[PDB]
């Protein structure tokens, strides 16, 4: 298998504008949303049909109950942060938890919080501690580190549970997640002349595109086009150089491709 990851986010907004939820939580496998919950629906729902087909109603009912509690916990924590900072009005609180299962079988796990779009508290599961960015985060770190059972529980969740959930979801979504759609690559020429190496129709989104000169020398001043979703489940990207024999090199999912420009 290629590298894969499982992540969950929580977003809390105090005093939100009309129609905007106070709380949202979304799960992802790689770049695919798999689950969603918000303070308006108050229901955990699938975001992928392979999630809906493989998880019985008891899964969605149990996690809906957990998310209604996590939602109230997020509201209380954000109100307490605003009191610590002496902040009024609308502020944001965010959380991201997740794990990676690498190609070589090794794993990584992470848990962190943000306040108003900046890193606030970062968990270290090896030293079993919280890294605080300022004095307010230090007060919270002090309270959270006093609960040693909770730190151990989070280390087990990241290292064992998260990975077991990821393997389970990877199997449910195998036809989507473990597929390969090779790129369709072309070179176009656009008194400044540029060569554009453009790729589209590929999956997974991870791709390496570069320009080389006279075989083995990588060219300087390459511009890159972001890897973007095409909207049909595939991705597109490009690499350009200003104009010696040039070739575009593309690496995607273990396959290396060369387009020599005459």
């Amino acid at each position, epitope marked *: 298998m290629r590298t894969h990851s499982l992540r969950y986010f929580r977003l809390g907004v105090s005093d939100p504008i009309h129609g905007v939820p106070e709380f949202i939580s979304v799960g992802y496998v790689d770049s695919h949303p798999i689950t969603t919950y918000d303070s308006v629906t108050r229901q955990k729902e699938p975001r992928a049909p392979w999630m809906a087909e493989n998880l019985a109603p008891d899964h969605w009912e149990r996690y809906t109950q957990l998310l209604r509690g996590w939602q109230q*916990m997020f509201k209380v924590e954000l109100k307490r942060l605003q009191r610590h900072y002496n902040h009024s009005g609308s502020h944001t609180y965010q959380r991201m938890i997740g794990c990676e299962l690498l190609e070589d079988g090794s794993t990584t796990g992470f848990l962190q919080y943000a306040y108003d779009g900046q890193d606030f508290l970062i968990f270290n599961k090896d030293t079993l501690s919280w890294l605080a960015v300022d004095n307010v985060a230090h007060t919270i770190k002090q309270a959270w580190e006093a609960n040693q059972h909770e730190l151990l529980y989070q280390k087990n969740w990241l290292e064992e549970e998260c990975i077991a959930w990821l393997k389970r979801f990877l199997e449910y979504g195998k036809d989507t997640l473990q597929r390969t759609e090779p790129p369709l690559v072309r070179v176009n020429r656009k008194g400044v002349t540029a060569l554009f190496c453009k790729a589209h129709g590929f999956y997974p989104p991870e791709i390496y595109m570069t320009w080389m000169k006279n075989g083995e020398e990588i060219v300087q001043e390459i511009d890159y086009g972001d890897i973007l979703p095409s909207g049909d489940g595939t991705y597109q990207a490009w690499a350009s150089i200003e104009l010696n024999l040039y070739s575009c090199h593309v690496e995607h999912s273990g396959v290396h491709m060369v387009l020599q420009v005459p």
Partner: T-cell receptor
Amino acid sequence: QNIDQPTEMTATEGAIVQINCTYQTSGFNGLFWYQQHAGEAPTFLSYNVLDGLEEKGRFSSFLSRSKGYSYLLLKELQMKDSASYLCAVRDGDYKLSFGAGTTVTVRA
Amino acid sequence: AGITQAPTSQILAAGRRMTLRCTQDMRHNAMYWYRQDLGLGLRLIHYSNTAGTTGKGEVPDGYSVSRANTDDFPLTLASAVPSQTSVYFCASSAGASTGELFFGEGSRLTVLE
């Protein structure tokens, strides 16, 4: 979905008693031991979620996640240790399940 | 600061309505109701992970709960039957994913025809 512990255990005061708990659950978020004296409420004794032995006074709690196994060890048994000992597991859906409990009888 | 339940003892004729009270001032979000019977241990009836929501346990039939507020979790027997003869325990924990249970004293209920 299955928590097994012996129904009863008897040992002499001053000795040791090891209470085994085996579990089969979908996912694992920790294992708890509680003590319940006859006609009283259960009270928390220990929590284990990583592997190994945790000591707390005369009581030790061990966990092996790969074996789905824990023990509660009561050392230098006292008459006041006669009680029911409950193991409980919080599974991957955060559902807490209890075993039937082990009644420990300390012989004078 | 603790958790208390009432009544601690009751004899009830079959068919009667009965509510067991449970209150805690520890600001715990998660509350639970268990019944305890010989050879079966503690079996969850209903639970609540926070004010405003509740879920079913392992043996919910013949019972209902409400959780309008954080402090209170009443268990109702709409029409008591003899099989509901048991020892009932209410419990609370900081959250469903965090903390140990704190149990109430227990309520012994005997339902007789």
